[PDB]
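Exercise 7. Predict the joint structure of the components listed below.
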Amino acid sequence: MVKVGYIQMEPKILELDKNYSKAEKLIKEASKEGAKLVVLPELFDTGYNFESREEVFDVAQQIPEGETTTFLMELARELGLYIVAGTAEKSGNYLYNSAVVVGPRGYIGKYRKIHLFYREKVFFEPGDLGFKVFDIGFAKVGVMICFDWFFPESARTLALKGAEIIAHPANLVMPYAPRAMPIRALENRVYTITADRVGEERGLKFIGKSLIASPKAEVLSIASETEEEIGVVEIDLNLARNKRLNDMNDIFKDRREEYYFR
Amino acid sequence: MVKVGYIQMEPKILELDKNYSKAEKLIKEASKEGAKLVVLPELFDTGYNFESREEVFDVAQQIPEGETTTFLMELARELGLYIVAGTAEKSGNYLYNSAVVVGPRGYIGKYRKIHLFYREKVFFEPGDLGFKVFDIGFAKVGVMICFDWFFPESARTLALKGAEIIAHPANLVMPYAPRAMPIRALENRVYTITADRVGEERGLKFIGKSLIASPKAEVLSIASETEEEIGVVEIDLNLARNKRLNDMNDIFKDRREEYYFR
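Solution:
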């Protein structure tokens, strides 16, 4: 078994340093509780509700040499844990709504949000790296961001590629995700870690309710709607690796692709 | 607007005539409430928990010439409505776990369960007609059976083919489907009608909880755990045809299948 957790925090729009300080305080708390993998919210460094593409472009960092990835690499190296975090990615003249994965030995990789939500389409380019699974030694972690939860194909693709844990940075505004995550975890027999932010930001109100769901649709930990907090729980990677729902049904062996999407 | 419903009943194993009589009584009740489409449970005619393949092979009816299909055709013509019902299908020397679709003018077609569950693999051949959508004039109805709900690809495929309502005969034994169906309805923006059976049968307990869910994950009707009953609700198919979630996101236009696993 291994302990993993979400970091439910409240980013202050455009205040990178303050957001790094807050992430560090909470990640250190999770580390003390024994977490070996922690997940931060979507765009935890920049905040979300931009009024123009220019205000986010002016603060967004490059991956992996920019400040956000460098800062997270330091925490992972010094605390001895893995981190998945949402961050605004600057790449040349372009911006992506991204997530970085870092561990004790350095940068591991990144994911770019495939399904953009609402006004994100005004600022960010749609993701173009596909749904990737990363090796964090003791497990394989898939990453998807926020609205990607809405399309069952996002988690499905990560799980079929071997993800045992789906790390899910989010800034939720609709009411549905908390009810859907246990089903995403169940249908793929994986653990999901949805790290949502809280707070009001220029008219948008995030719902909090970060949660960790098990392969049996169990809500192992669920956060408040408005408070910053961590949620760390022990998970059983063998419950996610063994896809046998019962002795006659292995969920992945039972798939019949020739009848899907056509 | 159109009224649709489920028929939750308790099939008595191997007692075909008794089960037809019960189905007729409840369908007449649904018709009196104005239902134009009704759904019966999986294997409503034969029961479910067979002790041997021989036991089900000896009572299974052929589709469409056998007694179950002709009985349902007579009933649909008499009442002027459409019926989707689960039935054991004899086809030569083989058996399929199937569902028939009949209407006021006669036989419309059938679906054979693609994802067999547990001991069903001992008696039935895996379905081989794909996930089909049937036109019943006022609606396009997709059909899947019981355990098909576990694979998100089942409902997704039906919805991509135009299903506005997914008719879902079921004999549920796990506790999960009632929690998952509203998510299947939401993610595809369709209405779902899960017609479950009730009762204990040779030591196997079915969970009841037939339910109808809307494109916004609303539970419009949910049945008891153990009683025979009907549930008929008014639905607006325009809410299933419009896949817009907000002014900048249409669920199906936003899918990016090139990144999804195969």
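Discussion. Residues 17 and 45 of chain B are 8 Å apart (CA to CA).
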